[PDB]
């Protein structure tokens, strides 16, 4: 809540009222991203007029002014020097300086916006300014791509002009181990996937030890390629799935144990309050059945929820009455009609109780262990970012999920690229010849052509085409990445032909005459060096071999340019428009000319997915030939038509995985925090003695309501408290709560001084926390298992009538309370109990 | 607009509050259709004291009293007597004695409306009445059937009723000569199908002379199954195609021609009109090149026209901007857009001067010669009824688009019949054991079953799992109706085991013990018996016999009855819930023990063309077996909404069809009461003479214009109207509407005496007939091909901007006025000059 007069940088108040028209498409905001840019580039000769060591020694300056409380400046303060400094430091590493357009898509990222940016506008080190400045807190940036082949390359590529600013730069990756991850994350920045970065925020909230723990906070994440990662990877779920490692040999003894025992003798029904309590008796005969002294000395053995749901399952349920037992499973039924009441199941155990008493063979399953979705994750962070070519059509959402703006940045050069209408034609057949036809035509005048398709089965189709015509090519199936995006950094080279299958090569641009850093870097590669391994070594190289690639290149590019520049020809429609003009904006980068155009036709995936197959009914039946374009309202429309549904489908599905989601969002961010404070060693007493209280509470409470008399029921509840904790006063004694909550007060003080007596000093802090964890574990994996059901089944309840969503929710709260519930007094049954 | 106090049939007035109280579902038609049914009972002592002889002349005495002029009487002051009679006689004949309730649906049919009777209430017979009745009047009534089989049995059937009361009874089928038709249209009532009746009135209004009409007009139709035939088959018009007759040879004899003619020269072309003039040289020189006298004398080649088209082709219409020449397709593109502007072609014989020009060859083609929808077809007649099981769910669209209201008639016997409801299963395979499971339970008690499908290919593979578990049965595949008949008629037997695809055996009713009737009927006839070729003894033989066949039939059906009756088995659902029900009314007739039941799979056909694979992947995930049956408020919803919206597509199929055929139902009125006027002799001296004077006006019109002074092109006036007609007085002779129009009369006058002196008195009035009827006949075929391509085409320009239909009106009425206006003109031509 801040003020702006005269302040470069906007201040939170302001940064909304610009965020604001932003959406309304006023565009104040890049006035100002340019005013900043302006300004830094005012402090290009304090910069430029540095040494090497000094220009390093500005990020130690820039910390000491970060702590410094005499003098209070803030990352918003260091923001022109920071940028300056890095920019400055690009321009003598890789001998490219950031331009005037780069340094305002880096402000926009340092406010927290999508900057929307080009293809070939260059985004990869845009990234560095606002990265480098971020890093400075000292809390870690994270940076999300693609793919691994991209993470590496990134952190490789710009981490030297981190590294050279002092800064520690690490990726994460696919193949790497716990303890090397850990130091990644221990770097200022870390570069990643998605995948990646959520399945190590999944296991670590996983993990049983602080120790295991990889990450170390969700503070800034600057995601490149925004739209693939944040809107369309976010469709689907992150998932650890594994055995559901059941109980499975305990409700098998107790089915056995729940028939020996005899009602009324070892146990009573409470027939009308749905409820059975075991007797003296009966805790004896379970005790002795199984050569045990107390039902709760066995770690991770709820042996009291074992027997009572046994027994619930023998008395209270009647087989044919509430379910059937079909094909080895327990099928629920309705009242007195008896219908099978698909998708249901019994909950807090019952139901494998049931399936116990009726001798079905208990399935070993795999169940979801940890997840969240990618909108969920990247809500984490205090400050999220992203960079794209394509982001305006993703604004609102972008907005609504991820409070993230969308800022169009300037091109660098004027954008001259001549993009034409589709060639729309009745069948694939045609458009292929009518493709080669061009491809053809275009490789004969040299000018490199870049074609894309939708599977590898026809990217292989053309490619046998243009063997047939003998064009030589290559083609890129999104499989290989590094060896693809060799052949994309030449693609843009005379007689170039580059079939791209999905859209294969992301992240290589096609520049003309070859991308020259991209050559480089590989020309150094094959000589043993290393960015990281041999840096020396790799720096005074890159310094010598830039000129001479950029010149071999280049004069290339001049060549290529009198050929028109890069040819894009699409092969058919992506499920959006977006990825459609993704591959457009291939060519023409940096202002050089280009052409884009796609062939369609009415055979297409996507048509026939639709009516494509009637309009070439119906333009047959009208004697159009095979070979003409079309060019018709109807027809386009049609096109138009298709792909937005696909869109709108799309947009469907990930809104479903997040709704759906928030529930269980809820439920995890309680728990996750639970685990948290018990793997931090916190000081577990008082929550220890609440659940002791809260659970005694809750047992009076239940066997005292009305009547208010001796005519009440005190061998129930003293024999039920009794297995619960060593129970010291008579019911003799007192003929209330408060008189219990004294004597298990006390018995807690002298179950303390046992541990004392058993492992010293403070084991009884330990004990606590062990038996919590071991309990949260392993109750709220088995509500994952119990959730998983819920929302499969949960859709075959939809009527106009009922929403599922809020259905979903009731019964998910209920299970997450009654989860709790029994949280609480198996721990202070645990705590009082178990065996050391 | 009558009375009813104290009148037994209601009429106008009435009859339509009685219709609306219908739609409002209050019954008081019932209960007045059912007073009709008890007066006529009251009838029934009068008439059986008649001997057959006193019966048959009853006949002779309603006509009698039908045409007295003095003692006025209607068919509806006859309706008792006539009933109580037709009555009587199908009682003596058939040995069948219409029931209460189908006297009551025999009133409905005589006031035109559907009687909706159920399966087994005797439909064929109830007809007879209303029939009988309105055949005494003189003018044939339709009685319409769903296929020729049918046809055939029931005017042999029904036949020997009407026989015995003095009509005649005929039967048009596929195989007839137009001879054979005009008999059987000739007799007193006539059966076929839509079919039949429909293409002999589409040949009628093609016929070349009166001699060759086979029907007589239009009076009054019962349709039998109304839903199949009024809704089903209504979705399909009835088309006559044919060869385009080409004019071929003529359009490429004048773009041969075109070129050898000289601009200015041999013609004028007035650019700024879009017009040419054929100069007196360029008459001349087409006459010497084809060895002719007048473009007018060789009847049935306008080539005025196509000479004029040819000359437009050359000099108006230019390649590569007009239009363009593709696979030897001329196609029309605009003037600086270049693109195909696909769907359109040129008008009145242009495009075929186009393509000649361009020597594209003239492709040999196929058209639409005559068309009518069953909608337009049996709205012709004046009075309209017609019978089902299954109406009341079609009343509003029976309503609308034909006037007939729907009456349920109640059923002579209380249905009792179980209808069970639906079994659904995940997988057709589960669905398919568990019916050979129903099948061979029942096969085992004796009970016979039939079991539905929805094709040929599930119904073998039922069959050759039947065989497989050892279970004799017949499949009837509505392929071969008699033979198929003959299975059906007896599967309501003990181990009646019969499969039937589609609608397999629709029309034969499955008596329990044996259809007694059909039984008697196939035993006369394997003997040589005939009820037209050996009526005497056809008739001896029945009397004698059906008493033998009902004994051994019903002793059987007792068994049959014991057993459950017939049980129904329908494996998939069909288009509509309608037909479902017309297979589950098979079952349970008269009052008969019965059950059916239908097995579904989210396999199904229906269910695979909407979201069946999905809750299938669904249940199988949440483990249902694939034996338990779907009980979920989701998955029955999921049925009944697809079949739901295919019953919705059809209607709008149905709907469009009917619409588009709107226009050219108003256009072909016309046409054929033209042909009509022509066939029957009239004289159209008057019309001939107001054509002639209707083009000379025209031509006056556009060429005196506006202006007024010396201008005005009065050479290139006369030399137009000179090739209509030998113009008698020089433009010189005034130095102008009226003076022309008074030569050309004393040209015609001429004209009249010189065809006098070759042929003798009325000879113009015969060329008058002949000359207009070629000239109709053909304008209308080639009318008819533009309108094809027109409607194929006309849903390619569109939007949700402009209305298809709309556009097709506006486009498609002044074709129609184009083509008039062009027969007007080359008839005047045609009638100065042909040859003789
Ligand atoms: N300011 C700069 N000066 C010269 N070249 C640059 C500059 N910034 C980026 N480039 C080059 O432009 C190309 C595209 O860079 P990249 O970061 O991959 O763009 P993008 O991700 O925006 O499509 C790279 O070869 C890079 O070396
Ligand atoms: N009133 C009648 N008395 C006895 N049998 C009858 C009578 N009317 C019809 N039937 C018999 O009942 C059966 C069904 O006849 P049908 O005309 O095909 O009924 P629908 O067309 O109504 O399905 C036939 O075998 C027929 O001979
Ligand atoms: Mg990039
Ligand atoms: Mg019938």
């Known amino acids: 809540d801040s003020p702006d007069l005269g302040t470069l940088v906007p201040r939170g108040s302001m940064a909304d009222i610009l965020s604001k028209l932003l959406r309304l498409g006023e565009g104040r905001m890049v006035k100002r991203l340019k005013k900043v840019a302006d300004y830094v580039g005012t402090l290009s000769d304090d910069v430029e007029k540095l040494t090497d060591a000094e220009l390093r020694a500005k990020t130690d300056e820039f910390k000491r002014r970060l702590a410094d409380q005499k003098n209070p400046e803030t990352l918003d303060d260091l923001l022109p020097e920071a940028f300056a400094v890095a920019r400055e430091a690009a321009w003598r590493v890789l001998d490219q300086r950031p331009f005037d357009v780069q340094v305002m898509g880096a402000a926009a990222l ?186 709760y000395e066995a770690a991770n053995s709820p042996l009291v929820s074992y027997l009572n749901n046994a027994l619930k399952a023998k008395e209270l349920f009647s087989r044919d009455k509430d379910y059937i037992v079909r094909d080895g499973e327990v099928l629920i039924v309705d009242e007195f009609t008896g219908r099978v009441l698909i998708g249901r199941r019994y909950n807090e155990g019952m139901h494998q109780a049931i399936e116990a008493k009726e001798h079905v063979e208990i399935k070993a399953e795999n169940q979801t262990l940890a997840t969240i979705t990618l909108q969920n994750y990247f809500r984490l962070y205090d400050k999220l970012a992203g960079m794209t070519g394509t982001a305006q059509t993703e604004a609102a959402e972008l907005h609504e999920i991820y409070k993230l703006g969308v800022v169009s940045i300037p091109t660098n050069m004027p954008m001259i690229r001549e993009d034409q209408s589709d060639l729309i034609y009745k069948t694939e057949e045609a458009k292929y010849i009518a493709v080669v036809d061009d491809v053809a035509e275009r490789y004969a005048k040299g000018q490199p052509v870049l074609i894309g398709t939708t599977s590898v089965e026809r990217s292989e189709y053309l490619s046998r085409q243009f063997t047939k015509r003998r064009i030589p090519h290559n083609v890129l199936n999104a499989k290989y990445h590094e060896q693809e995006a060799t052949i994309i950094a030449v693609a843009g080279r005379r007689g170039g032909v580059t079939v791209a299958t999905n859209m294969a090569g992301r992240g290589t641009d096609i520049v003309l005459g070859g991308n020259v850093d991209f050559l480089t870097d590989q020309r150094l590669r094959e000589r043993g060096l290393d960015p990281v391994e041999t840096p020396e070594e790799y720096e005074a190289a890159w310094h010598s071999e830039l000129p001479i690639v950029k010149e071999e290149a280049s004069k290339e590019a001049k060549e290529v340019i009198e050929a028109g520049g890069l040819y894009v020809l699409g092969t058919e429609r992506h499920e959006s428009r977006r990825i459609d003009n993704q591959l457009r904006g291939r060519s023409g980068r940096q202002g050089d000319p280009g052409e884009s155009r796609f062939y369609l036709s009415l055979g297409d995936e996507l048509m026939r997915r639709f009516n494509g197959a009637a309009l070439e009914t119906l333009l047959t039946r009208l004697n159009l030939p095979d070979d003409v374009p079309i060019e018709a309202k109807m027809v386009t429309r049609a096109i138009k038509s298709a792909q937005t549904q696909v869109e709108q489908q799309n947009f469907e599905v990930r809104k479903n995985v997040l709704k759906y989601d928030e529930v269980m969002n809820q439920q995890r961010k309680v728990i996750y925090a639970e685990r948290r404070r018990i793997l931090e060693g916190e000081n577990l007493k008082d929550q220890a003695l609440d659940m002791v209280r809260d659970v005694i509470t809750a047992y009076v409470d239940g066997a005292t309501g009305e009547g208010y008399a001796e005519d009440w029921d005190l061998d129930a509840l003293w024999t039920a408290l009794k297995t619960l904790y060593p129970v010291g006063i008579t019911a003799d004694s007192l003929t209330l709560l408060e008189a219990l909550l004294k004597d298990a007060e006390r018995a807690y003080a002298a179950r303390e001084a046992e541990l004392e007596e058993i492992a010293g000093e403070g084991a009884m802090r330990q004990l606590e926390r062990n038996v919590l964890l071991n309990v949260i574990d392993r109750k709220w994996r088995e509500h994952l298992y119990e959730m998983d059901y819920l929302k499969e089944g949960i859709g075959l309840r939809a009527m106009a009538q009922r929403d599922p969503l809020v259905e979903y929710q009731r019964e998910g709260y209920d299970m997450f309370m009654a989860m709790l519930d029994g949280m609480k007094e198996e721990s202070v049954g645990f705590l009082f109990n178990v065996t050391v």
Not at 280 to 290: A, H, P, R, S, T
């Open 110 to 295: 340092h406010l927290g916006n999508v900057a929307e940016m080009k293809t070939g506008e260059g985004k990869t080190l845009t990234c560095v300014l606002p990265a480098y400045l971020n890093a400075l807190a000292g809390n870690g940036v994270h940076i999300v791509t693609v793919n691994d082949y991209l993470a590496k390359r990134d952190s490789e590529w710009m981490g030297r002009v981190h590294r050279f600013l002092g800064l520690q730069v690490g990726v994460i990756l696919a193949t790497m181990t716990p303890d090397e991850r850990r130091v990644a994350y221990n770097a200022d920045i870390t570069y990643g996937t998605n995948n990646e970065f959520g399945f190590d925020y999944l296991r670590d909230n996983m993990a049983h030890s602080l120790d295991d723990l990889v990450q170390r906070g969700h503070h800034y994440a600057i995601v490149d390629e925004v739209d693939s990662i944040l809107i369309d990877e976010a469709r689907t779920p992150l998932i650890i799935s594994g055995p559901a490692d059941g109980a499975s040999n305990w409700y098998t003894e107790f089915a056995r144990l729940a028939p020996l025992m005899e009602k009324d003798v070892h146990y009573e029904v409470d027939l009308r309050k749905r409820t059975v309590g075991v007797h003296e008796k009966g805790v004896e005969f379970v005790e002795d059945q199984l050569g045990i002294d107390n039902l």
